[PDB]
Amino acid sequence: GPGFDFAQAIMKKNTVVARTEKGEFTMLGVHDRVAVIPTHASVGETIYINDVETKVLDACALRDLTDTNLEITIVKLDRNQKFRDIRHFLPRYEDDYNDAVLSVHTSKFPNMYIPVGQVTNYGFLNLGGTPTHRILMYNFPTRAGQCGGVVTTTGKVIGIHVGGNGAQGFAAMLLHSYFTDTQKHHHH
Amino acid sequence: GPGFDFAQAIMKKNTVVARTEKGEFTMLGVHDRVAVIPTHASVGETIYINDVETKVLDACALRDLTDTNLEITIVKLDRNQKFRDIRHFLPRYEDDYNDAVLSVHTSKFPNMYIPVGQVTNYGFLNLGGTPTHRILMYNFPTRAGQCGGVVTTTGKVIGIHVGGNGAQGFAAMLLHSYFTDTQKHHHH
Ligand SMILES: *[C@@H](CC(=O)OCC)[C@H](C[C@@H]1CCNC1=O)NC(=O)[C@H](Cc1ccccc1)NC(=O)OC(C)(C)C
Ligand SMILES: *[C@@H](CC(=O)OCC)[C@H](C[C@@H]1CCNC1=O)NC(=O)[C@H](Cc1ccccc1)NC(=O)OC(C)(C)C
């Protein structure tokens, strides 16, 4: 079946409820004090984390080399506790997957698992006026409230939920290389 | 962990979306064409089952010997397909349980699993003006939309969700003896 044990270990040790001006979102912590959230959450210089207001020390809105939105935002947070390092569970490349689980941690749904089935490397998606690349698609009627939700298969964290059309769900792909300790770049 | 495989086999072979004048509800089919739904769904002489209008051949609103509401309604339906017989998974007696799962099958949520943790034999609950007996309680903030949702542990179907106060969830207890092939009683 789907890897419910796996999805549940990600949820407990690595998610938080994040609230911006836009609303609440499942937030996945990746390593240290670094986490991800969908770009359309519109992150400021502070954010609510499990209702505790938190300084956002850095926010990178990923775009690709064609200058197109990837809908992932990597955030560095001022918190005391470190996230368990889950980088080794990030896929190295674009891929297609079987039998995924979508997990949500919000106020409304502090803990919920949805098998979404087969996931496909979709590519381009118009996220309502915003061209976006590198999308994963599942055939499941996903809802508002589910954004930020973490998509797993066993041993792999593959994306975070970002959209849906009433019949399909869409996640922003997560790749390992988004998070390697890197470069000397003026980025703002 | 919680028995997610078990909860998922119940959902696939034994639930349906049921819609009355009151709205949509997860519906658990128990055996043959017999199913259950919360009494406050207010079942008529027809019901929507997976959007297909269906004759309700019989509806028994269980009450106990003190003439108090149990919040379970057993319905016999005019459908072609039989439910897999799951009576052998009904607990024989009142009990307390560990690590339960609450599963929902509605239009809004065709498939969703919520670990609710430890479940306790609660007893009396005022269901908003309706004294009700034989309630199970879990510490989980359950929501409208979840009524009818099936509460399992591994190998046991124990109740169907019927209420919640913002902090706890409440299920109507299911017992094996509710469904044994029985008696010669004028019941309406
Ligand atoms: C999650 C975002 C949300 O909850 O809105 C807060 C402002 C949305 C999930 C979608 C909504 C309906 N089903 C479903 O799975 N995502 C969206 O609505 C995106 C836009 C967005 C993404 C992330 C944060 C904020 C806003 N838009 C979208 O899905 O558009 C279509 C319908 C074209 C794909
Ligand atoms: C499910 C019923 C529903 O969806 O309403 C349709 C008319 C409700 C689940 C509750 C609601 C808020 N959280 C939660 O877990 N159940 C109720 O609202 C019951 C009444 C009811 C039960 C079943 C069918 C119809 C109506 N009432 C209730 O929970 O009251 C308190 C708050 C006192 C326990």
Question: Summed up, what is this model?
Answer:
Chains A, B: Residues 1-179 form the Peptidase C3 domain. The structure is a homodimer of 188-residue chains. Chain A is mainly beta and 188 residues long.
Describe the protein.
Chains A, B: This is Genome polyprotein. Chains A, B: It comes from Human enterovirus D68. Chains A, B: Interacts with protein 3CD. Chains A, B: Residues 1-179 form the Peptidase C3 domain. Chains A, B: It is found in: Host cytoplasmic vesicle membrane; Host nucleus; Virion. Two copies of one chain form a homodimer. The first copy, chain A, is mainly beta and 188 residues long. The first copy, chain A, folds into two domains: 1-14 and 84-188, Beta Barrel (Thrombin, subunit H); 15-83, Thrombin, subunit H (Beta Barrel). Chain A is 6% helix and 50% strand. Chain A contains one helix and twelve strands. A six-stranded antiparallel beta barrel of chain A has the order 1-2-3-6-5-4. A six-stranded antiparallel β-barrel of chain A has the order 7-8-9-12-11-10. In chain A, strand 11 (156-164) and strand 12 form a beta hairpin. Chain A is globular and about 40 Å long. The relative contact order of chain A is 0.22. The complex binds ligand G81 (2 copies). Residues 22-23, 38, 40-41, 127-128, 142-147, 162-165, 169 of chain A line the site of one copy of the ligand *[C@@H](CC(=O)OCC)[C@H](C[C@@H]1CCNC1=O)NC(=O)[C@H](Cc1ccccc1)NC(=O)OC(C)(C)C.
Q: Which key features would you list for this structure?
A:
homodimer; 188 residues; mainly beta; Thrombin, subunit H; 2 domains; 6-stranded antiparallel beta barrel; 6-stranded antiparallel β-barrel; 1 helix; 12 strands; 6% helix; 50% strand; binds the ligand *[C@@H](CC(=O)OCC)[C@H](C[C@@H]1CCNC1=O)NC(=O)[C@H](Cc1ccccc1)NC(=O)OC(C)(C)C; Genome polyprotein (chains A, B)
